[PDB]
Every structure is written in C-alpha cells, then in structure tokens.
Ligand binder design. Sequence first.
Ligand code: MN
Ligand code: MN
Length: 272
Amino acid sequence: TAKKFKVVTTFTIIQDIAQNIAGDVAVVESITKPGAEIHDYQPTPRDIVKAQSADLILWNGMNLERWFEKFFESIKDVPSAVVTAGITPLPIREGPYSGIANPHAWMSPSNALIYIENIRKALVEHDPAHAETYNRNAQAYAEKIKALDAPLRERLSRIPAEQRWLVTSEGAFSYLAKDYGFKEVYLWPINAEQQGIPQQVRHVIDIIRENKIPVVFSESTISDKPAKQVSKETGAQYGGVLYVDSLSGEKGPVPTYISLINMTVDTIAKGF
Ligand SMILES: [Mn+2]
Ligand SMILES: [Mn+2]
C-alpha cells in the first residue's frame, strides 16, 4: 504494497535519524533541504501541502524552528511530536536570546539516544502495524550511536584539557563541547537577524590572543566570512566548515547524522 506510512520532519538531521528507525516500512521526508538555514526558514505553500500529506510530523522544539508553530496552524488532523522531549536544555549564554534553550541538542550523541527513543515511541504509537520493525531498528541504531563514543574521544585525545577551545561562528556546539570537555567561543550565540556580531568579533579576537587558540571554524548553513576575518586578524588557521544544522546532499561528505558527528569531530581534531 500500500501507500506507506509517511513522516515529515522539519529539517534533515531528524529526517536521517527517523529514516534509520523506519527502515523500509515508512517514508521520511524533510521540509528544509540540505544546506538551507533552518532557524528562520520561511515556509512556502508547497511546504504546507507536504506536511498536510504526512501521517506524522516530527520537529525539534526548544524553539529551534522559529517558523514551525505558525506553520503548523495551517495543518489539520496530523499529529506532531517534539523529538527533544526529556532532554535537559543548555541555556543560551549571551545576546538577545540569552536564557532561551540552546536548541542544538543532537550534537551530543548521548542526547541522540533520547531523540531515537522519542521517534521510536511516536512511530510505534501512530503506526502500530510495524511496531516490531520500529523497535528492532531503533535498538540497532542506538547501538551504532553508542559505538561512536570511544573513537570520537580517542580522536580528540591529543589536545590537552586547557587547550580544548572550540571557536565557531554560531554557538551551536555547546552540547558537543560539554560532552568532550571543550570551552566554547562563538561569533554569535544562535542564528538570527541580530546586532552585536562586529563587537563579538572583536571579543573573539581578544580571547584567541590570551589563550593562543590555534584554529577557528564556520558552519555549513551560514557565511564563512566572519570566521575567515577572525583568522586573518589573529594568527589562527581557518579550520571550518563544520556541520550542525544540516546534512549534505546524499552524495556529499555528510549524508547521515553519524557522518555529521564524525566529520565535525574529525575537522576539529585536524585543526589542532
Ligand atoms: Mn502521538
Ligand atoms: Mn543553528
């Protein structure tokens, strides 16, 4: 056979996690495309029809998708589920969104296990005919995620503790940084139309000076120009691109959530 159970997700990371749980018994599609900015995405009429055709809608919550609640108002009779349920938020530390949840919880692979469980539960509840495929796929995929911890830590193990400074454009790596003992510095705390970046750019250059930070990075859905300037004004090498808010295309270097975590840690590690 019939027309398969259809899941629509707001962005690509959730799409890939959900598709691993769904296997071939459900079809999972993302509203946003690879490479597109997800926080302030502007949905189109095509997007309403796509979401309205789903049997279940998955979104991040933690107000990642500033567009979603207004968007969902146009969708009728389709259940939605927040895939971060039960995750404890790290607060945004500075700027006009200080004190709001940092939404990038998927960058901690231990948090990913909670994403998987929330998605499994939603799939089993709303598609009970395939409960055993979902439960089997979710346990197998959770073991793939747990198996990342040892190679990831080993990959970062050369960098001594007080050299572990991670300097990015968006402050999108706070969950990854807490997991692996890095201190975070960023050019802006969360993607948004905002003031303060040129004054934050001076501050970052300042903090690179004091601590002799060797590398700075950018991310794949935003501009590399601020990070490349900070590298020019310091001696630090420009290390990016890092992946957090989007996968690549299916043929690019980051087609899956696992490849996103691995390539991001790999790129950090080679910068030092
Ligand atoms: Mn439900
Ligand atoms: Mn982001």
